């Protein structure tokens, strides 16, 4: 029971300190050669998670840690971890000194609501849609990168267009489904553009006329076949209704529109592009209305989706891009159309835009906002030792417990700054307590200072999720007591 | 401070004694130094890095 | 990447880089956090280029000949 338990504390521990110096943007790089020659050269420590050998239950737990954070907020992927990890090492004085496990997670839960509530209102919240501190929140955020000249270029698009749609999901907060997004290689960093319903970026080489303003959308996946019985019908029934753009698919087999069909839909010459991506079939389904059919005798009247300009044309003056607007609910993943001659400016502008996702939704899903960087973990650790000091029972330790294990968030970021870290944390606790909440460590210039003044700042609900998911793996290892191998 | 033109006594690439440079000719485009020393600066900055290894 | 620039001065930009890793290994070891030994290399090559700058040469103008002339002559010493 307790032999099992400290096991599970040691190897959680021993795999969020693993990556424990990877934390802040001075967070140097790894390499770890482990398996069959992985050079895993990456300061980053999301996906030193993703390549780390794990075989311990709690060791794989802190991974899943890793994309739950991923996939909440996309930002704070190792504090997650490391704050698990302190609070796992700081389970061990509980263990000892005698308190069960069941009183150790139930305390934690008190911390961490009381963590909440306190972080909640000791921040600056936005008022408003407020566009300016979402483009300050964008230089806090686009910037630092190679799309740093392109921020001007991405931030303001996916401003105006969260503007365009303020979307109704999680109380009108921006999900992933405002304006649908595309991306094509070659062009310059300037062709992007925000577009009005779905675009394709695949190759549709027509001679003939694809220029329909009623362009009548249909999804058949029934590409043609080798045994004339069940390949002609679906083209007859093109013949019948009219939908002069279609997407092809080749759910059925490899020759997709043989030249007696390709003939017979190039005498009125229908938009062909096959192998279209199945994650955003659904997608282009839920934009167009048409049904995602490939039985031909399902092919009905109703399954005549709607758009209003569809072109085969050469955006940007050589992108020979199919952009579609007037549908019955386009606007499925918002809109950068990444053009880039180069390789590095297509990934990072996208991965970077994808940043800027998960920025936006994090300041309007939670609309507050704190500075970031040591300062509202020093805060937790002063006022959460003062509750426990309130606190009775069992209890007042292990909320203070929870304290001293807040405090390895400023001290690595003291330690990755190359500041003495212990001197630097208790003066930072000493500054505070008679002072301010924005306090901290500005790591971008290596120095303690209030950092609302130099601009290290953060969204709330990083913080929020981070603390909420590293409590809860922390209570559920605490209560985890047993293993068994052998079904 | 009126030496100021005791600068460019460099090593002499042949023999090896301390000699003029700027009267013997000796010389080397300041882009080509500049870049080395900024190559070798980025080199030296990323081998660092990677230290928090028990490797 | 510092061969595509120039050509030569690849043994010197491994040397020095050498010799730079080979200190900082020194001075971590007095426990000195790498990231101040970095930010140090920086600022030491940010400062040592504009002493390069402020003394440079540009005497090889079209009346700087006597010094190219013995620059052609010292190129071809004992022949």
Known sequence: ?487 | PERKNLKWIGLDLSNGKPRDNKQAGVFEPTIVKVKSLKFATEAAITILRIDDLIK | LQDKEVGDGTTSVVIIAAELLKNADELVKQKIHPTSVISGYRLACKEAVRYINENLIVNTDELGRDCLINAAKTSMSSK
């Open chain 1, 1 to 487: 029971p307790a032999q099992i338990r400290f096991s599970n504390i040691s190897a959680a521990k021993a795999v969020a300190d693993a990556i424990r110096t990877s934390l802040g943007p001075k967070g140097m790089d790894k390499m770890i050669q482990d398996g069959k020659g992985d050079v895993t050269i990456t300061n980053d420590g999301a996906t030193i998670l993703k390549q780390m050998q794990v075989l311990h239950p709690a060791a794989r737990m802190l991974v899943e840690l890793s994309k739950a954070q991923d996939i909440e907020a996309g930002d704070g992927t190792t504090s997650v971890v490391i704050i698990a990890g302190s609070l796992l090492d700081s389970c061990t004085k509980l263990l000892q000194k005698g308190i069960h496990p069941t009183i150790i997670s139930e305390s934690f839960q008190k911390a961490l609501e009381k963590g909440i509530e306190i972080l909640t209102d000791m921040s600056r919240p936005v008022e408003l849609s407020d566009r300016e501190t979402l483009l300050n929140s964008a230089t806090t955020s686009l910037n630092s990168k190679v799309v740093s000249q392109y921020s001007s270029l991405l931030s303001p698009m996916s401003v105006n267009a969260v503007m365009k749609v303020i979307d109704p999901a999680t109380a009108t907060s921006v999900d992933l489904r405002d304006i649908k997004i595309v991306k094509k290689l070659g062009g310059t960093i300037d062709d992007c553009e925000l577009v009005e319903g779905l675009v394709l970026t695949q190759k549709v080489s027509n001679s003939g006329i694809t220029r329909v303003e009623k362009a009548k959308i249909g999804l058949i996946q029934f590409c043609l076949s080798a045994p004339r019985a069940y390949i002609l019908n679906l083209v007859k029934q093109i013949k019948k209704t009219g939908c002069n753009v279609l997407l092809i698919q080749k759910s059925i087999l490899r020759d997709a529109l043989s030249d007696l069909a390709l003939h017979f839909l190039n005498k009125m010459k229908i938009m062909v592009i096959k192998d279209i991506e199945r994650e955003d079939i659904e997608f282009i389904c839920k934009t167009i209305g048409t049904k995602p059919v490939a039985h031909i005798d399902q092919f009905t009247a109703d399954m005549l989706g709607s758009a209003e300009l569809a072109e085969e044309v050469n955006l940007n003056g050589s992108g020979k891009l199919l952009k579609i607007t007037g549908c019955a609910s386009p606007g499925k993943t918002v809109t950068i159309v990444v053009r880039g001659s180069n390789k590095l400016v297509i990934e990072e502008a996208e991965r970077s835009i994808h940043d800027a996702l998960c920025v936006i939704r994090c300041l309007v899903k939670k609309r507050a906002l704190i500075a970031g960087g040591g300062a509202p973990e020093i805060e937790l650790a002063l006022r959460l030792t003062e509750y426990s000091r309130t606190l009775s029972g069992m209890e007042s330790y292990c909320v203070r417990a929870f304290a001293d294990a807040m405090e390895v968030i400023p001290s690595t970021l003291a330690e990755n700054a190359g500041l003495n870290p212990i001197s630097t944390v208790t003066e930072l606790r000493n500054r505070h307590a008679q002072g301010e909440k924005t306090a901290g460590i500005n790591v971008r210039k290596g120095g303690i200072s209030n950092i609302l003044e130099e601009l290290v700042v953060q969204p709330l609900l990083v913080s929020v999720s981070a603390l909420t998911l590293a409590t809860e793996t922390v209570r559920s290892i605490l209560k985890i007591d047993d293993v068994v191998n052998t079904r």
